Short mmCIF file of N, CA, C and O in Angstrom, two decimals:
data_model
loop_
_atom_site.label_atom_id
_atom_site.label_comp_id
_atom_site.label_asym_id
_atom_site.label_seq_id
_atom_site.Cartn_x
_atom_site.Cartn_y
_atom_site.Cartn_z
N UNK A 1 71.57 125.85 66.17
CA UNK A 1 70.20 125.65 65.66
C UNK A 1 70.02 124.57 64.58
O UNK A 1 68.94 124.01 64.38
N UNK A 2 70.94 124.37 64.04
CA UNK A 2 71.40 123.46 62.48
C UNK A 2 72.02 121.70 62.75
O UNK A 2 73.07 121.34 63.27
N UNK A 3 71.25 121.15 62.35
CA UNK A 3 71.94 119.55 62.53
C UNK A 3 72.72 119.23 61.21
O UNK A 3 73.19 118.10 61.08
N UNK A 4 72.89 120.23 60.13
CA UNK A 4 73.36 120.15 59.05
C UNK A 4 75.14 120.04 59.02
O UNK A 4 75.73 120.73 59.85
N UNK A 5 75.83 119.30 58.21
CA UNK A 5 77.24 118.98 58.06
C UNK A 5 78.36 120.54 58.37
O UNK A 5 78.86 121.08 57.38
N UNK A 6 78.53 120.87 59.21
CA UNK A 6 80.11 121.53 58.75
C UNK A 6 79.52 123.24 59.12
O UNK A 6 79.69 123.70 60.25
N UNK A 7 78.85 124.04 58.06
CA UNK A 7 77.85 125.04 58.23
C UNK A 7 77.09 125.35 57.41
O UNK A 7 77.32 125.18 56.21
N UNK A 8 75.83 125.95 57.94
CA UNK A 8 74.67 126.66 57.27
C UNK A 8 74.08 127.75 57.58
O UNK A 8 73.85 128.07 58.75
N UNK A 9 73.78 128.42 56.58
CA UNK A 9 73.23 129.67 57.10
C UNK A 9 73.16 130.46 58.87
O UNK A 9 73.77 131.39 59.39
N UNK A 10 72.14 129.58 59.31
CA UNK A 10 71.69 129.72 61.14
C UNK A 10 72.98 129.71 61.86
O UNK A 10 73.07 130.28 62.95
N UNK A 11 74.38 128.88 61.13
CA UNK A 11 75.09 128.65 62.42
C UNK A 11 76.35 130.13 62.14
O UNK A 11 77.52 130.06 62.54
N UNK A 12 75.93 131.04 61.59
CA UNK A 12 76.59 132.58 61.57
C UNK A 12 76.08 133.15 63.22
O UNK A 12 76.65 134.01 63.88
N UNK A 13 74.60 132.22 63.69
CA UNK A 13 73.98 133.16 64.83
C UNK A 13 74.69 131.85 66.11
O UNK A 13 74.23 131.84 67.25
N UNK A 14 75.60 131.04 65.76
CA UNK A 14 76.33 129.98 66.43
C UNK A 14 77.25 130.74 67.64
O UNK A 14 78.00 131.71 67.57
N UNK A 15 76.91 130.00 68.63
CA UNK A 15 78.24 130.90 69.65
C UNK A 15 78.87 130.03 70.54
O UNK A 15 78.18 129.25 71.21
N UNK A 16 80.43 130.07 70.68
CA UNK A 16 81.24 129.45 71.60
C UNK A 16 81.33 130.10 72.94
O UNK A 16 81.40 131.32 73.13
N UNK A 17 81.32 128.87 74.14
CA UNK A 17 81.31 128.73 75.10
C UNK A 17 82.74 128.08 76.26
O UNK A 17 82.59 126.86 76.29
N UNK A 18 83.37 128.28 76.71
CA UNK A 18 84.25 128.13 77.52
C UNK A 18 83.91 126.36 78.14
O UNK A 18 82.75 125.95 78.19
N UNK A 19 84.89 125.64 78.47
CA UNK A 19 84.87 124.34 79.68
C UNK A 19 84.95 124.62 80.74
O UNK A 19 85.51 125.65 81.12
N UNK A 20 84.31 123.64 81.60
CA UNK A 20 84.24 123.44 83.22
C UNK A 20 85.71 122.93 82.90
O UNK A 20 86.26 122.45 81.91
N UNK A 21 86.15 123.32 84.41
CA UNK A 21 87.62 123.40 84.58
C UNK A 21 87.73 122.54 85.82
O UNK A 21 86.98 122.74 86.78
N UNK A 22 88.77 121.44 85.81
CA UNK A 22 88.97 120.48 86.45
C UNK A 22 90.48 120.11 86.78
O UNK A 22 91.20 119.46 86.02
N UNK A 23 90.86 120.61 88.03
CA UNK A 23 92.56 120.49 88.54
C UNK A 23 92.76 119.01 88.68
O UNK A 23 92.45 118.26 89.61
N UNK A 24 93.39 118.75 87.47
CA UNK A 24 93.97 117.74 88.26
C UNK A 24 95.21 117.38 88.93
O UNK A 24 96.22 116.97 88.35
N UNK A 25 95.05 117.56 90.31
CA UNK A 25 96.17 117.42 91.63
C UNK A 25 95.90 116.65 92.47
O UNK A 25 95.00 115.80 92.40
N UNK A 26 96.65 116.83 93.38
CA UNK A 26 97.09 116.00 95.05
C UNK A 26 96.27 116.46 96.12
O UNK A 26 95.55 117.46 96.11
N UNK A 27 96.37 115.93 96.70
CA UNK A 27 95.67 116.16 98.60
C UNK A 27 96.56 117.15 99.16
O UNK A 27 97.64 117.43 98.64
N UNK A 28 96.07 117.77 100.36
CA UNK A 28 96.50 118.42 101.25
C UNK A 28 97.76 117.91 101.46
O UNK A 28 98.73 118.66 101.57
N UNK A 29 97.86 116.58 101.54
CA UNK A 29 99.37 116.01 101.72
C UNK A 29 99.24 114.71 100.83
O UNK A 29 99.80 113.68 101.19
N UNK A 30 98.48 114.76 99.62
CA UNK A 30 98.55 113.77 98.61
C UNK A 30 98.72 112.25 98.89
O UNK A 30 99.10 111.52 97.98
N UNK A 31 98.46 111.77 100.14
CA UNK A 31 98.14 110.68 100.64
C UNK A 31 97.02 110.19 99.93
O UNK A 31 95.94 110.77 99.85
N UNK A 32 97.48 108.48 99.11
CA UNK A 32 96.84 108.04 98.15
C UNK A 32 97.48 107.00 97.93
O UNK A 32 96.79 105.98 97.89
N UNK A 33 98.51 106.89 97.78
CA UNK A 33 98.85 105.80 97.46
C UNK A 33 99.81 104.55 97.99
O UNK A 33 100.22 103.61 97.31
N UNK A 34 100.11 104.91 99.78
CA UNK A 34 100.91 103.70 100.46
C UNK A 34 99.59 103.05 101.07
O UNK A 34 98.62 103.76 101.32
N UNK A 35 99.59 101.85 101.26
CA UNK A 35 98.12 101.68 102.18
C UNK A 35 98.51 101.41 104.20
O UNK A 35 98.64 100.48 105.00
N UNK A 36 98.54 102.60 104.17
CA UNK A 36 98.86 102.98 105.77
C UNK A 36 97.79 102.34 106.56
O UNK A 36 98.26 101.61 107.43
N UNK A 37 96.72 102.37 106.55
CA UNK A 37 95.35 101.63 107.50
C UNK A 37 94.84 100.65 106.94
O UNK A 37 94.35 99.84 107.73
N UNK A 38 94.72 100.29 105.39
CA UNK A 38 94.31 99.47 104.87
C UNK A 38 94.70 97.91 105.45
O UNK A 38 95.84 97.56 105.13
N UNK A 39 93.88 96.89 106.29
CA UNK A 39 93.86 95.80 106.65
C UNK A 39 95.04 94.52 105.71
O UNK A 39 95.91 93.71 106.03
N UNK A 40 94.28 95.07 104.24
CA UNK A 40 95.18 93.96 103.21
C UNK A 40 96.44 93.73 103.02
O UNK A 40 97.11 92.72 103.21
N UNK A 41 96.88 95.36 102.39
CA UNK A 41 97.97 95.43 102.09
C UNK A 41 98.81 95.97 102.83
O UNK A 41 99.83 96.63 102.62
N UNK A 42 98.39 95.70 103.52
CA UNK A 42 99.53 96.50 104.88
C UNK A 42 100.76 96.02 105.22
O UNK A 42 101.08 94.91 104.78
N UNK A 43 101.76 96.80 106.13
CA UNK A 43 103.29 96.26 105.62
C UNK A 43 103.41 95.69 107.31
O UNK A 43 103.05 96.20 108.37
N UNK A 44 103.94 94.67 107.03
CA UNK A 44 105.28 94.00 108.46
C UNK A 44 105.62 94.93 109.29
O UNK A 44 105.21 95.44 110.34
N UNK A 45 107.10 95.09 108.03
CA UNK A 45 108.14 95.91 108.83
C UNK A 45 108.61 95.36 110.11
O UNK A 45 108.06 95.81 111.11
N UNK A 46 109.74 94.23 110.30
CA UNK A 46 110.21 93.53 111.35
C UNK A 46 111.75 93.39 110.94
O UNK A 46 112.31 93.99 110.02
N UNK A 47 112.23 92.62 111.68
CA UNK A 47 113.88 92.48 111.76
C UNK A 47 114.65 91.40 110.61
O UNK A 47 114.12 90.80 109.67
N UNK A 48 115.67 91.40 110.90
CA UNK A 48 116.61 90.15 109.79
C UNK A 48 116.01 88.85 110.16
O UNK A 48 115.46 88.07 109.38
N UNK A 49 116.18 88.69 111.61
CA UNK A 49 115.65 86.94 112.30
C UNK A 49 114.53 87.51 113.45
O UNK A 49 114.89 87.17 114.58
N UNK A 50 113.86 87.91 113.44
CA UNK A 50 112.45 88.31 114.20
C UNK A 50 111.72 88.79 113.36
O UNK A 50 110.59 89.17 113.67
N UNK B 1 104.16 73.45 136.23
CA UNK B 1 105.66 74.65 135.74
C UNK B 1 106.41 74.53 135.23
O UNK B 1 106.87 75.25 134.34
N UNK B 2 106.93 73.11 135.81
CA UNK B 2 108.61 72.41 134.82
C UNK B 2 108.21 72.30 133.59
O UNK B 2 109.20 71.98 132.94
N UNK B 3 107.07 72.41 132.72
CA UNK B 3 107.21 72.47 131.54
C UNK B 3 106.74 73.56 130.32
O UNK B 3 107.19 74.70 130.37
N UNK B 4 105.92 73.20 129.35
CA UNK B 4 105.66 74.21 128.51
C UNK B 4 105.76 76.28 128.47
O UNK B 4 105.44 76.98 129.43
N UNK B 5 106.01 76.55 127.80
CA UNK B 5 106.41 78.11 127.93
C UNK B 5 105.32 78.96 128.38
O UNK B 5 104.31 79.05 127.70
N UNK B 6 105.48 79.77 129.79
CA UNK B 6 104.48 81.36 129.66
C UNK B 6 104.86 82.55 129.57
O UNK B 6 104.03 83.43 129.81
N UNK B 7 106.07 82.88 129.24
CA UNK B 7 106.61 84.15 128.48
C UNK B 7 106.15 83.97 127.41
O UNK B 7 105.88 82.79 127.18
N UNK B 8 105.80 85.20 126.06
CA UNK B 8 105.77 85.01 124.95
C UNK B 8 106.53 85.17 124.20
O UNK B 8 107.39 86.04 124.05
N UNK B 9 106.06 83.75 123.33
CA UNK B 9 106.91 82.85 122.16
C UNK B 9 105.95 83.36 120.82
O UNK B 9 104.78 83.57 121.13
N UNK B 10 106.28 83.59 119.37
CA UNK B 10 105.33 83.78 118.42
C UNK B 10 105.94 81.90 117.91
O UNK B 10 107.11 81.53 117.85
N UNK B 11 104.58 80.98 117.58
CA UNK B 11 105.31 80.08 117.32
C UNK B 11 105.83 79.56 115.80
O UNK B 11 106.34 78.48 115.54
N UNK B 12 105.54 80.68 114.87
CA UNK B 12 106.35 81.00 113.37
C UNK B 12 106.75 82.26 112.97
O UNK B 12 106.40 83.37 113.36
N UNK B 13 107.80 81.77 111.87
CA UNK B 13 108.50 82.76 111.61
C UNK B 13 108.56 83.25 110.20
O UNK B 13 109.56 83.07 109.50
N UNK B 14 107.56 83.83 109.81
CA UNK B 14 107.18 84.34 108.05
C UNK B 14 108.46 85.01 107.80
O UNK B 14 108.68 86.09 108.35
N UNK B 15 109.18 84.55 107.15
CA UNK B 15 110.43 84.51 106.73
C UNK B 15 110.66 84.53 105.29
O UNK B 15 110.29 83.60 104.57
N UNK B 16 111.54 86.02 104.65
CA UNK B 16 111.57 86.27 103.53
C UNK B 16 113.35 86.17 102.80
O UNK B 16 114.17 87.03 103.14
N UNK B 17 113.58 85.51 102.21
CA UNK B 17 115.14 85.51 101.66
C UNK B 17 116.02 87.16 101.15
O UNK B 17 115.32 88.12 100.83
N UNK B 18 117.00 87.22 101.15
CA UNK B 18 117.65 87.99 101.10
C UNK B 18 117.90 88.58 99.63
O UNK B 18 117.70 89.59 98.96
N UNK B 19 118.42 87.38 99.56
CA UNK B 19 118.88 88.10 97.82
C UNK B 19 118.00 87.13 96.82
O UNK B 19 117.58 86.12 97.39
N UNK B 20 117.67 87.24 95.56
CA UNK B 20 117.31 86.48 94.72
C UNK B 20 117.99 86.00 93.25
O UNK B 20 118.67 86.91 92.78
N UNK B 21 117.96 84.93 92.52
CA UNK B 21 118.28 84.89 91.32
C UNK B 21 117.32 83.81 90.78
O UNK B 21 116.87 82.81 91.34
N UNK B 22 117.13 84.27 89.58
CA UNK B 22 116.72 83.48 88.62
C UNK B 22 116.73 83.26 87.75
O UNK B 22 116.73 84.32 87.14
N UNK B 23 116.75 81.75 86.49
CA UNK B 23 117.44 81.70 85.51
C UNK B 23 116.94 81.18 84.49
O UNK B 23 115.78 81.45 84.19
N UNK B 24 117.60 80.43 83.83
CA UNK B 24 116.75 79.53 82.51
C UNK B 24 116.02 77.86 83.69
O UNK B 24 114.88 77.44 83.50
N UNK B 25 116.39 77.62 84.11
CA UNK B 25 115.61 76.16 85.19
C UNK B 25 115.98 76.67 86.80
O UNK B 25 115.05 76.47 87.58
N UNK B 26 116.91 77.14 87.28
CA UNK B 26 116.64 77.15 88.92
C UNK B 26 115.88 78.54 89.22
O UNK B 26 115.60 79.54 88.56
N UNK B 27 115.68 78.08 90.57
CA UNK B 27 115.35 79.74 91.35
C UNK B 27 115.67 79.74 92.45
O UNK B 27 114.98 79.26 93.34
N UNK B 28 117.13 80.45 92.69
CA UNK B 28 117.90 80.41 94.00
C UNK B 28 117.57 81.32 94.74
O UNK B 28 117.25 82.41 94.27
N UNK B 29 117.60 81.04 96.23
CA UNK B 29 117.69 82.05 96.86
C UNK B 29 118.13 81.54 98.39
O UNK B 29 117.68 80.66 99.13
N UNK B 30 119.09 82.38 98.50
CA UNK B 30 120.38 82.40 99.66
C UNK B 30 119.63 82.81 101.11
O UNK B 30 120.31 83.65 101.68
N UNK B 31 118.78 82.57 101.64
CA UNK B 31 118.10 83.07 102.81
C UNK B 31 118.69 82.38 103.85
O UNK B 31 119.11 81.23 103.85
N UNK B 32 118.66 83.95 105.58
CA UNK B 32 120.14 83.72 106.23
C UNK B 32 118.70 83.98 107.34
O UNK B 32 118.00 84.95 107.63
N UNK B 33 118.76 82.17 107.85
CA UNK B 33 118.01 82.33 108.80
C UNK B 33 119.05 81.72 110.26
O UNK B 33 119.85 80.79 110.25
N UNK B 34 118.71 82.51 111.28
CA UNK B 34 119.42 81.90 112.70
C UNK B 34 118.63 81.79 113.06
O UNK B 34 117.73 82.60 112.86
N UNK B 35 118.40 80.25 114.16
CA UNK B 35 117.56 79.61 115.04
C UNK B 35 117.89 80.79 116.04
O UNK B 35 118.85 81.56 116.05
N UNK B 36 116.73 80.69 116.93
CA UNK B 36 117.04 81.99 118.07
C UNK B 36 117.54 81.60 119.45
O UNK B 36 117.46 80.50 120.00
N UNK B 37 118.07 82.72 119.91
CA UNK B 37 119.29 81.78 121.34
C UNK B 37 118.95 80.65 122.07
O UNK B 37 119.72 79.73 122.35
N UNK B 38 117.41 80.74 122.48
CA UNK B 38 117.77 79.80 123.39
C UNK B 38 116.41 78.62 122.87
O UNK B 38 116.44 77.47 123.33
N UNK B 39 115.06 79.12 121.73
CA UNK B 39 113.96 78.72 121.24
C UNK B 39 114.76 77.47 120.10
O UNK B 39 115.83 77.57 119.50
N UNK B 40 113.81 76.40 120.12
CA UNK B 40 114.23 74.84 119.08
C UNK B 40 113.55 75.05 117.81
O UNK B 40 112.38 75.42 117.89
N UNK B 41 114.06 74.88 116.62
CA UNK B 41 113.32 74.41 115.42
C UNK B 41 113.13 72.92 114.68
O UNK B 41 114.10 72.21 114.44
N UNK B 42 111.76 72.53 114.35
CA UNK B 42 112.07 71.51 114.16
C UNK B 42 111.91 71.53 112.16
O UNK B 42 111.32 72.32 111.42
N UNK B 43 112.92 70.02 111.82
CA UNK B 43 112.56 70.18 109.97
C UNK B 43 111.30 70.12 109.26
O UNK B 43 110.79 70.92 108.47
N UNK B 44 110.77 68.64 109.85
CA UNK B 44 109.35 68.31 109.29
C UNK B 44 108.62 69.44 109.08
O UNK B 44 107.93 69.45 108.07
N UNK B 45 108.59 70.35 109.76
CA UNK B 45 107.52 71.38 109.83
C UNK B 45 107.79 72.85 108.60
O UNK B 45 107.25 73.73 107.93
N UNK B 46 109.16 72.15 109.04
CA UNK B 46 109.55 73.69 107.68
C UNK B 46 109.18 73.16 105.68
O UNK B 46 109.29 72.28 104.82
N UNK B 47 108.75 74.41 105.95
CA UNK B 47 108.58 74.31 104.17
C UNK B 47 108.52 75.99 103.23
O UNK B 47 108.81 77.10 103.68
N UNK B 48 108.10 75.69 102.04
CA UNK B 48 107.66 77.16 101.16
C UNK B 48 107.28 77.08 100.56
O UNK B 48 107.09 76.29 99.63
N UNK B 49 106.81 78.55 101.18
CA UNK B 49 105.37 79.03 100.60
C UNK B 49 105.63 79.68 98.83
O UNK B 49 106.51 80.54 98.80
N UNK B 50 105.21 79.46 97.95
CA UNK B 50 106.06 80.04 96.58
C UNK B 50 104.73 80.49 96.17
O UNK B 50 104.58 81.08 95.10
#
């Protein structure tokens, strides 16, 4: 209720609240980071002399 | 008929060196290319790409 420094009176009627909760993980099979279809960076993969 | 190729030929060869070194002024690199059994290479045409 209070825009006042630190506390005042009103903020005795002050109440804490919990965070949104956010996993941070992988994919089903965490595919992300080779570029398998990507046009650009895509790999060769050929022989010593071919 | 008697001349130019219709089997397929790719007519370059993106070609990457083997080992590398590098130093205070050169930058060597030992790349182990074989002309192929029975296909010609010519020099003029060769160069690199850096």
């Amino acid at each position: 209720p209070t825009i006042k420094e630190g506390n005042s009176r009103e903020l005795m009627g002050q109440q804490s609240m919990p965070n949104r909760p956010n996993y941070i993980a992988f994919r089903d099979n965490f595919i992300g980071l080779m570029y398998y279809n990507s046009t650009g960076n895509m790999g060769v993969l050929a022989g010593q002399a071919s | 008929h008697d001349v130019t190729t219709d089997r397929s030929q790719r007519l370059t060869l993106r070609f990457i060196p083997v080992d590398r070194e590098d130093t205070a002024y050169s930058y060597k690199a030992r790349f182990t290319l074989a002309v192929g059994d029975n296909r010609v290479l010519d020099m003029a045409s060769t160069y690199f790409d850096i």
